[PDB]
Every structure is written in structure tokens, then in C-alpha cells.
Amino acid sequence: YSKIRIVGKIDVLTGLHIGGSMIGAIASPVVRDPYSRLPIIPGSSIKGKMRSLLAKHIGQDAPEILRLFGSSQKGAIQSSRLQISDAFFSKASQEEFDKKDLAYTETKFENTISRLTAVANPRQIERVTRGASFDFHIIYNVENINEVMADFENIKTAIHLLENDYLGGGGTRGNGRIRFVIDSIDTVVGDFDSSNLSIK
Amino acid sequence: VVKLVKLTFKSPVHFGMKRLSDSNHTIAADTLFSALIIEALQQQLELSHLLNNLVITDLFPYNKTSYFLPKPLIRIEGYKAFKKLTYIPVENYSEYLRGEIDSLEASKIAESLNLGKASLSTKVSLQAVDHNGESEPYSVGNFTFYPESGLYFLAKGNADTIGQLEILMHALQYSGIGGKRSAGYGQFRCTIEDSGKFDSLLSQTGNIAILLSSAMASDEELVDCLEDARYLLKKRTGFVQSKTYADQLVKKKDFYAFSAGSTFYQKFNGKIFDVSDNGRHSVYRYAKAFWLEGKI
Amino acid sequence: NKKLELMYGSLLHDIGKIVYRSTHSKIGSQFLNKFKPFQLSGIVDSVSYHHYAYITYIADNIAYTSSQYAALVNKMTDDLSNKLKVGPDSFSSLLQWTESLWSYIPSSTDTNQVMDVSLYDHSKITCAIASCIYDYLTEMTKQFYQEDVFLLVSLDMSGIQDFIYNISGSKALKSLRSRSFYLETMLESLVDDLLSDLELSRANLLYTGGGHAYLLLPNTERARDVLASFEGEMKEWFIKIFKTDLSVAIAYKACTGEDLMNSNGTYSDLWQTVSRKLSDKKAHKYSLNEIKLFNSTIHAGTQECKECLRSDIDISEDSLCKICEGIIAISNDLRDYSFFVVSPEGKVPLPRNRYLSVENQDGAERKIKMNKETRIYSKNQPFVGKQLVTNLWMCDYDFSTLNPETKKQGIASYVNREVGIPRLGVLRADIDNLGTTFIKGIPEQYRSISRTATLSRQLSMFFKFELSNILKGARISVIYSGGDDLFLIGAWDDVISKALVLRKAFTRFSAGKLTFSAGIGMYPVKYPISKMASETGVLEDLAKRGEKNQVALWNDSKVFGWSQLEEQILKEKMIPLQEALTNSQEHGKSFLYKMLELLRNEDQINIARLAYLLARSSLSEELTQSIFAWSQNKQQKVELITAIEYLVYQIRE
């Protein structure tokens, strides 16, 4: 039984909103660390988006996605192979934003025009400012050696889809475009070889 | 061989106690022992050695300044401050046993605790949306530790047992502990080192004895130990977490154990209990006793 | 029935004082002899001996306009003639009859000492002590006080607050109301069961607190044996129904006659002794056989009940447990129907293999005929004509239940507004230091057994009886008043208004010695009930954190004194702003938001920008100076910000 640590940085190409009040105030705050107040990307959002994109690509019922993201169906209890930690705002990006006195999270003012009265309703959303970076840690559990390559190809397809997709918030409207840069792939636990394995 | 194990948590942890919404700052020894058993099963390591030769302590808070033990259950001759005082620095705890701690210093110790902050993440399930349904919200409890703070526990065992614990904890670093692990929580880093201070608290002789872990004695030991004791009887219930156990997830048999920090004038040895019912493998619950001797 | 006559005489021993106010004892014997049932020798002898039976005399030792008295005497004559009778189980109606009328009457008039003890309290304490002395004598003055003739017994429930919020939250609003009611009524059932075994009236219950009972019992060894039997019975019953979810402990301390009189200060120290035993018993709380019972359960069970999370008990199709389902069902009946019926068959289980079910007044009498020894508790009924009933006070105010069509909607009708933001206001209020105050609310010299009971009784009435009158005319639904801690849900506009009205009525009730800290939240209707209670409780925790009187309105940052919120915000600032928008055609929500953006800006430059904005705004000169002055001050700015927000919320749509 081996474990493969994936170390990576997620780059905010367009303002990221993962959601998670007073009048006249942003009513859609992003998820933030309760202590450090640095906005984060919940690992649940990454895992769910990857699972959804894998479902769309393969098609959930499919045995491959179910093993990768966990199964609780009767007679088919499977442990999730992808344990993805919540993304943490990176130190380098934190320094680059400390310079030039730039806030970590931009606010975006949006309006909806009604189809009947043509009136406009205004919403202020919080988005992680474009150019930010979130360290991402993923643990892949090698339950079976024979399926490692196939699972990693599935991960690669999911990552590529997410590069062309968004992450959280309203992505059909521009929010959530992200790019994954993987710092390293390495076998933290066990003797398995992950040198040839590339997430992207 | 008492070994102090310190866990510093990178991401928030759930550590559920009764629901998914609520979060506990620590876990009892039974949860950590179950995690160790699961890890040994995954690593193809024998369970008998860990079950027999290992006695572990509940997880307890610590800061850069002090390591906090549970408040002993002893008679107090104000009371709201002592109720609020859940954890005491180990140097303060001997004074608390001596009874020198007043109400104001009790409140000061209680406020001194800077373990971390408990939050509640609001998430959704979108599975139904694809199958012509609506999304459903839910909530996951979280506890994020301050950068200096962390959790710790003391483990006593043979040298081979200690090495096996080291390997299992090295794996548990990435496996994680608590609820909603493998979904963004419970990730931690562990460091195991001998601790002279804890050994000094370990070696002690007193009229009274206090549990460091959630435990319960067998009936024969219960007859002698129960008398002249002040204890908190906590219920340990849960769903089995395994693929081998059954086709569908099955609840464990309800257990009741003396909470850590309970005071017994007569000590009892612990017992590993089986809360399995009609399952393929027996589900183990840790009820062994870790003892500290004190004078009141 | 000599003991029965003693209770009748002891409670009525001071009845001659009232007619005197209109040898008072001789008049009372003369007055009481008029009514035929009240002609037993013990009843008549008790009235005469009090001024100087012998037990009535010694019991009394331990303890406006005449026209108004005459009318009350005239009313008392009518009630005694037609409504009141002498007999076993008929004393309870009499004890209610005394409470309704004699509460205002002072025990002693035209006396130098404080008239802080009501006649009902004086009579009730005398009646309770008289029964205690009689039981001790059946067991078999200055020397009498020295010997220990009384036991101080208190019982406290455990995990009552944990049980209330045991909700899955699938049906939280109804569960929270009923679970609190069940704990309150189950407490009364336990008290009534203990008194019935001892053959004592409700007079022996000196006072009650939520989750707690304070009783005075005879020191006779027979009564001590009952406590061993009663505690062991209820200890096993709770284990049967609630496996460690609920518990009760009973501790008794022997007290002499001088202790009750507070001679040498032993009275206050007496309670501290029993409480320490009570807490020591909660430390053990279980026995060896009880412990082995818990871990001897054979099969865990496939499915579990959502609220209870218990799999051992039978679980129905809707996944509710046997206890849980009744609690949800009983919730609807309690608000609609006044009478509480302890029937052998019902919804929510009660000890001694009985059940609790809420029934109509015709349902209550029907239940009485079906089963003997059935207990009936009325809710908020001041009438004492009804027999075999004990009046229980509860706060059940719902504006939705006023209209059957609105009752269908529930809290959703509160957000239904013609104008203003549709939001649900949540109020969580708690009395400040009430546990500490109850010890220190009265001086040690003034402290007495009758003194403390009046304090608890007065607080209980305000939490439940008086609160419903306060909320009259407001879209507010009381989830529960419990004891000192309140939980209300209603329209954001009416919750804030009534919280101020609650505060001012509380001050007059407590004469300023007591304050309560509350947190107020604002949520949409679709917002979960459980999250409303959790987040608003933290807001209260903020107001409680500050010294004594504080309120947390909406966001945590907005914390103000009750006088500050009512006067400095709503009246000083918001009212001029309200008339400003109406009066000026140019002024619009847009003007308010622009001022609000300049406010909430730490830079002092925005203060100049506000003045620039105010200059061309064409606002009235007095208000323009007022708004500018408020902005410059650090504290007044917060108040001005809140003033605009309230106006913005109140004027939406």
C-alpha cells in the first residue's frame, strides 16, 4: 500500500469565487481560513469538480470515477483514492500582493436585468484576485498497483478539463478559470515508483 | 517507554462527536486507536501487537508555551470558572491537585488556552442535479489550530511497539484523522520524541489516580474500582468504517467508557472491547487505561 | 384525616387577618365556621391557636384599603361557599385558590419590619412546615427549634440543555418548543410523584427552577426511606427511556428549626451543603449494575432515529424513534390545547409507566373518568374553580396561530410584508448573573425560606405569564422561554421592537436590580432554524461578554446598550432620517447609500467628503448639522450607520 503526494500551485486566471448579511455589503464572501483569513479553495470543491468532469468525459456509476473518488453503495464500498487538501493561498503570492498594497480578494459588482420590467438588481461578489496562487496537495492511495496508470490518466483528463473548465462560482460568466502547475509528484509512503507518472 | 507524539494540523479537521455539523478540538484514544488499526490493515501490518502491547492517551491541546492535560474530577470546596476550565497546563495541574488554584487563576488558565478556532463549512451535493434533481446543502464542522498550537498524546509500549507506532503515524500523516478526511480535512504532520516533563508527571505516587484516556474496566475490575470514584461516563457510538465488514455500513454496538481525567482511588487495567455484531470482522474499540498518580 | 385537617387549617390560619383588615384569629374562626365543610375541629382549632392545633401555632413561629379587603373577603366568601370543599386531593384546588387571591396581601401590615412576604407565601410555608412537624411527631418550643425536625431536599435534572438541542433539524422549530416543554412538565410530574408518596401537598415544594426542584420535607425516617425509593425508581426509569441522555439526583440534608428561621446565618449555608452533595452525586451518577447494563446490549441495530441517534429503540418508517415521534406530535397540541393530561396512554412517556398528552378541556375531564389517579395540569389558567388540576405556567405566544390560514404558513407569514425587507428576526436573551444573583439578590439578614421562594416565583411568572402580554400585537412566535434563557423567532422589525419593550418591562419588574443580555439576528425565511439559534446564541454571547447590560444587534460589530439602541439610534437618529426621505423629493435610497459609503470609511477624508455631499444634498440645515456632528464622533458614527441601515431595511420594496 503506497501513497503518492502531488504538490502543485493553482493559478487564478480569472477571479475565483467558492462562496461558503449587512445592507450595502458584499453578500457573497469567499471561503477563508478562520484564523489567517487567507482565502482558500476547499479540497471538496476540487474533488467534486474533477469527479463531475470525469463523469461527463466517461459518460457516478462508472467504476473508474467511483474508485478514484470513493463509493458508499451497498456491496460496493470503496475508499476514495484521491484525498485532496483544501488549497492554501501561497506564500509567494502573499508577498507579491503585500507589495504594491493589493488586497487578496477583489469584489466584483454585477447586475441582473429582468426580462419583464427591465429593472436591474445589483450583486457584489468576492473573487480571489486574478494572479493569485494556491498551493494544492493531493494524496493518491495505491489500493491496487495494476490500476495506477489508468487512474493517473483519468486524473490527467480531469485536470485538462478543469483547465478548460472553471472552479466554483459562476464559471459560465468568466469566474473560476484556473491553471494547475504541479511542483512535484513523489511517493511519500511505500516503495512505488511515481517518477514516470505526470498529473499533466 | 512513554513517547510524546505531537500533531500539527495543516488543514482544518472535523473530529466529529455526534453529527457532521459539530466539531471537537480533540479526539478520544479510541478514535486514534481505530485509525492506527485501519492504517496497520492498509500497510499489511499485524494487529495483535498493537492491540496487546500498546496503551495510548487521549489527544490533548498544546501551545508553544504549555501542554494541557484534562481537568481532574476532584471535589472543590467560582464554580462556573472551574466548569469553563477544561484543560490545565501540566505544571498548573499539580497545583490544581494540591488545591491551591483559585477561581480567578482557573479562569486565567482557561482563557490561556489558544488551541484554535472552530468553524463550520457549508457545502453541497450536486449529484441529484444531473439526475433531474435539486442540489442539497450540508455542513461540516472544522477546527483550525493556531500555528504554534497542536494536539499531542503519550504512548507507552515496547520498543518494537514504539517503532510500529512510528511507522503507522508516518502513514497517518497522509491518511489523516477525523471526519471528512479524503475530502479536504484531517491532514496533519506528526513528530514523535521522548518528553522528560511527561515522564516526570508519569512517575508519581499519590492517593488518587486520574485517567489520561477514555477507558472502561471489565466487570471484575469494575467491582473494585467503581467505589469511591468521581467519573464522567461518555457514550462511544459510531458507524463501522470498513469495506470488509458488511455489504452496507452498519452501526457499532454502543459503548460506555469513563472519560479521560476521571478520578479513581483504585486503578483498573484496561480492556480492548469488541463492538461488532454479526459482522465479517470484529470491530475493535480501545478502552485501555493510561494513569497519572496525584495527591489531593 | 387529622393531617388533612391540619393542612386545611394551616393554610387558612391567617384567613382571619384578611377580615380583620376589612384577635383576628377569633374573627377567622367565626368567618370559617360560616361555611359548612370548613367546620372540622382541626380546621377551627388551627385558626385560633395561630394568634398566640399546637402544630399550627409552632409552625407560625418558624415562619391596602379596607373596602378592597371587604370586596376580596366578599369574593372569598363566594368561592368558599360554592367552589371549595374539604377532602383528600381537594387541597390542591384550595392551594391554588389561596395563591390567586393572597399573593397581593402582605403577611404582616402596619409593622416596622419589611412587608416583603406575601400572605400566601406565609400561609404556604406554615402549611408545609405544619405537615413536616406532624410527620415527625407521628414518627415519634425553644428546645423544639434546636432538634432537627426538617430535611432540605433538592432534585436536579442532568443534560437538560443537551436534550433540548438534540434536534436533527429536519423539524427543529417544533422539536425545540416541545422538548423544552417535556422537560418542564416531566419535572412537575417527578415533583408530584414524590409528594404523593410522602402524602404532602404542593406547599412542601418551596420553589422550583428550570431543571431543578427545592422541597422541604419532614426529617422522619419514613420520609428518608421514600427518597431512597423514589430516587432509585426514577434513576432506573430514566436509564430505561434515556440511556444516559437524562439523569436526576436527589440529596437531603437535615436542618433544625432555627436553621429555617436563618438564626445565626445557617439558612444560606444549608443550601450550599445540599448543592455540594447534589454535585457529588452527579459525579458518580451511576452504579456498578447500571454500568454493566449499558455495555450488555446485544445487537446495535440496523437503523437509527435521526434526532435521538439511538438504534436500540424501535425505529419507525419515517426514521423517528418512539420517544422522538411523540415529541414532534405533542408540539402542535401544546400550543392549541391548554390542559396537560398525565394519562396511562398518550404520546410522550412519563415516569411510573404513564404518558403525557395535551387535551382539550372536554378531553381532560374524559381522561379523568377513564383512569383513576390521572393527573391534570392546566396551562395559564388563573381560575381555581376547576378541581384535581395544578396550574402550570408556560409561554406559548404565536402570531401565526391567530389565523387558521396563517397557521398553515407558520413563520413564513412573518416575512410576508407589504414594505420592508422580508427577514426573520431571532432573539436569544438570558438574565445576567441570575445564578450568582439568586444567591446575592437578597441580604443575608433579609434572606429567608419564604424570601427566596418569592424571588423564584416572581421570575417564573415574568418569563412565561407576563411575556405573552408583552409580545401582544407583534409577529413573534416564542420557541421557548424555559427559565432565564429565552428563544424567540419573528419578524425582524417586531423582534427588535419587543426586545426593547421586554427590557423596559423587565427593569420595572426587577426594580433595576436585574438586567438581561440578548443577541438579535436577521435571517431570511428559508434560512434553517438550527442555524438561527446557533448564530444568534453567539451574538448573545457577545453581549453577555461585555459587563452586564448589552445587546448584540444584527452583526457582532453592532453591539449597543439597551438604552443606546432604543434612544440614541432609533429615536435620536432614525426618526429624523425617516421624515427626511418623505419630506424631500430629491432625497432617495440613493442618498442614504452614498452617505453610508462615506460612513464605514476610517479615513478622515470621508468626513470632509460627507460635508461636501451634505452641502449640495439640499437637506434641512438642522439635520445637516446633526448628521455632520454624528459622523465626526467615533461612537456616534456607529449609531448613525445603524440608524440608516434600519431605515434602509424598513423601507425596502
Curated annotation (Swiss-Prot), chain A:
Similarity comment: family membership: Belongs to the CRISPR-associated Csm3 family.
InterPro entries referenced in this protein's UniProt entry, alphabetically: CRISPR-assoc_RAMP_Csm3 (IPR013412), CRISPR_Csm3_endoribonuclease (IPR052216), RAMP_III_fam (IPR005537)
Keyword RNA-binding: yes
The protein's assembly and partners: Part of the Csm effector complex that includes Cas10, Csm2, Csm3, Csm4 and Csm5.
EC code(s) of this entry: 3.1.-.-
Enzymatic class: hydrolase
Single biological process term from Gene Ontology: defense response to virus
Other facts: Encoded in a type III-A CRISPR locus.
GO MF assignments: endonuclease activity; RNA binding
Gene: csm3
Superkingdom of origin organism: Bacteria
Keywords annotated in UniProt: Antiviral defense, Endonuclease, Hydrolase, Nuclease, RNA-binding
Function recorded in the entry: CRISPR (clustered regularly interspaced short palindromic repeat) is an adaptive immune system that provides protection against mobile genetic elements (viruses, transposable elements and conjugative plasmids). CRISPR clusters contain spacers, sequences complementary to antecedent mobile elements, and target invading nucleic acids. CRISPR clusters are transcribed and processed into CRISPR RNA (crRNA). This subunit has the target ssRNA endonuclease activity; it cleaves multiple sites in the target RNA at 6 nucleotide intervals.
Name this protein carries in UniProt: CRISPR system Cms endoribonuclease Csm3
Pfam families: RAMPs (PF03787)
From Swiss-Prot, chain B:
GO molecular function: RNA binding
Keyword Protein biosynthesis: no
Keywords from the named record: Antiviral defense, RNA-binding
Database matches in InterPro entries: Csm4, Csm4_C, RAMP_III_fam
One biological process term in Gene Ontology: defense response to virus
Domain of life, per lineage: Bacteria
Note: Encoded in a type III-A CRISPR locus.
Main function: CRISPR (clustered regularly interspaced short palindromic repeat) is an adaptive immune system that provides protection against mobile genetic elements (viruses, transposable elements and conjugative plasmids). CRISPR clusters contain spacers, sequences complementary to antecedent mobile elements, and target invading nucleic acids. CRISPR clusters are transcribed and processed into CRISPR RNA (crRNA).
Summary of subunit composition and partner proteins: Part of the Csm effector complex that includes Cas10, Csm2, Csm3, Csm4 and Csm5.
Family the UniProt entry places it in: Belongs to the CRISPR-associated Csm4 family.
Protein name (Swiss-Prot/TrEMBL): CRISPR system Cms protein Csm4
Gene: csm4
Curated annotation (Swiss-Prot), chain C:
UniProt cross-references to Gene3D superfamilies, sorted A to Z: 3.30.70.270, Hypothetical protein af1432
Coiled-coil zones: none
Disulfide bonds: none
InterPro entries associated with the record: Cas10-Cmr2_palm2, Cas10/Csm1, Cas10/Csm1_subtype-III-A, Cmr2-like_C, Csm1_B, GGDEF_dom, Rev_trsase/Diguanyl_cyclase
GO biological process: defense response to virus
Keyword Transferase: yes
Cofactor(s) it depends on: Mg(2+)
PROSITE patterns registered for this protein in UniProt: GGDEF (PS50887)
Reactions catalysed: 6 ATP = cyclic hexaadenylate + 6 diphosphate
Pfam families for this protein: Cas10-Cmr2_palm2, Cmr2_hel_dom2, Csm1_B
Domain GGDEF: 422-556
Misc remark: Encoded in a type III-A CRISPR locus.
Family: Belongs to the CRISPR-associated Cas10/Csm1 family.
Name assigned to this protein: CRISPR system single-strand-specific deoxyribonuclease Cas10/Csm1 (subtype III-A)
This protein's encoding gene: cas10
